[PDB]
Amino acid sequence: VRTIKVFTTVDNINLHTQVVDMSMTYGQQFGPTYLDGADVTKIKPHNSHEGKTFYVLPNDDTLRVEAFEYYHTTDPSFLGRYMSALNHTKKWKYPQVNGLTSIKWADNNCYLATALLTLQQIELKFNPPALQDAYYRARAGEAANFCALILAYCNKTVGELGDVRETMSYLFQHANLDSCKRVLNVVCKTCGQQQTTLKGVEAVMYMGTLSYEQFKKGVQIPCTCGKQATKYLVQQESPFVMMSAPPAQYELKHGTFTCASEYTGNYQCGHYKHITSKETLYCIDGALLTKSSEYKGPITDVFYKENSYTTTI
Numbered sequence: 001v002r003t004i005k006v007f008t009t010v011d012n013i014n015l016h017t018q019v020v021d022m023s024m025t026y027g028q029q030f031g032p033t034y035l036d037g038a039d040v041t042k043i044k045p046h047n048s049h050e051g052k053t054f055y056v057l058p059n060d061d062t063l064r065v066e067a068f069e070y071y072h073t074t075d076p077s078f079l080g081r082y083m084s085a086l087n088h089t090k091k092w093k094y095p096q097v098n099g100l101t102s103i104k105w106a107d108n109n110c111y112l113a114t115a116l117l118t119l120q121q122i123e124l125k126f127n128p129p130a131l132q133d134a135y136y137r138a139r140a141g142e143a144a145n146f147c148a149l150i151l152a153y154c155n156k157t158v159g160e161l162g163d164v165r166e167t168m169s170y171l172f173q174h175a176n177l178d179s180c181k182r183v184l185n186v187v188c189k190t191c192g193q194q195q196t197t198l199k200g201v202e203a204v205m206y207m208g209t210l211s212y213e214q215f216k217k218g219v220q221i222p223c224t225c226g227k228q229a230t231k232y233l234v235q236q237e238s239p240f241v242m243m244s245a246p247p248a249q250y251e252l253k254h255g256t257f258t259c260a261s262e263y264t265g266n267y268q269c270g271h272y273k274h275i276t277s278k279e280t281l282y283c284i285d286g287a288l289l290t291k292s293s294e295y296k297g298p299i300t301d302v303f304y305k306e307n308s309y310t311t312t313i
């Protein structure tokens with residue numbers, strides 16, 4: 001019996017010393033086993049593996065507690081999706097573009113890059129520690145684990161076409177938006193005024209218009225009477241708001257928003273690009289960067305910084 005010493009983990013923080021038999025596979029000794037995302041379940045240990053750290057599935061109480069506190073789940077389906085995704089996103093390149101971490105294009109990841117650039121420009125705290133840790137390193141330039149975790153938490157695989165707003169809505173449900181609140185009024189001339197309150201993710205996202213300013217002044221929506229009603233923002237308490245609308249030509253002005261999602265395509269497929277407002281307007285497309293003092297293009301999401309707003313209507 002020849003052996004080597006290795007470490008197993010589920011969180012990459014608590015390391016557990018193991019002795020492994022070099023005549024058996026990792027699968028025979030640990031169950032499913034991953035080396036930096038690469039599935040080594042069906043391979044035998046090699047001399048170079050001494051002292052290396054391997055991911056295993058939560059198969060005992062120590063590992064179950066560690067995975068539960070780190071990912072907020074012990075389901076072996078999750079860690080497998082995460083490792084499968086990580087085996088690809090560790091080979092993506094993550095260039096700094098206009099001071100933000102982007103992703104060089106690969107595996108249809110334009111939507112992922114647009115969402116990653118967006119997460120770096122809005123105040124947000126994730127509840128699962130795995131998400132918050134990988135978030136910090138994603139800001140620092142090493143976003144392989146963040147992107148793999150996003151794909152895993154949203155039940156998305158590498159290469160699949162994706163939607164930025166669906167992605168953001170998933171990630172928001174894993175963030176601490178408990179304090180967020182929105183109060184809206186809907187006015188009809190022949191029916192009266194109705195107030196509704198929303199909390200959490202619903203207080204932070206709206207579908208139907210891109211302009212925060214128009215949201216505050218009022219938007220027309222069909223009413224129950226068959227006439228047309230006016231809906232407007234009464235009160236907002238959130239670190240940011242996300243206005244979305246079906247892709248359409250929109251004029252973005254410097255200094256009036258935080259960032260935005262460009263979308264050229266149809267309802268099945270399109271190209272996602274990222275507009276950000278710094279000292280001027282910038283468009284980021286993977287590793288590509290252009291600027292313009294004026295912008296008129298197809299926008300589908302606009303992000304605004306917010307703290308507390310109260311109407312004067």
Ligand SMILES: *CC(=O)N1CCC(CNc2nc(NC)nc(Nc3cccc4cnccc34)n2)CC1
Nearest residue numbers: 105107108109110111161265266268269270271272
């Ligand atoms: C930037 C990015 O990641 N991005 C833009 C290019 C597309 C191309 N890939 C792709 N994959 C699939 N899979 C089914 N389908 C399409 N469809 C498509 C592309 C372009 C035009 C039209 C027009 N009508 C229908 C479909 C398409 N494209 C990947 C995502």
Ligand SMILES: [Zn+2]
Nearest residue numbers: 188191223225
């Ligand atoms: Zn009415």
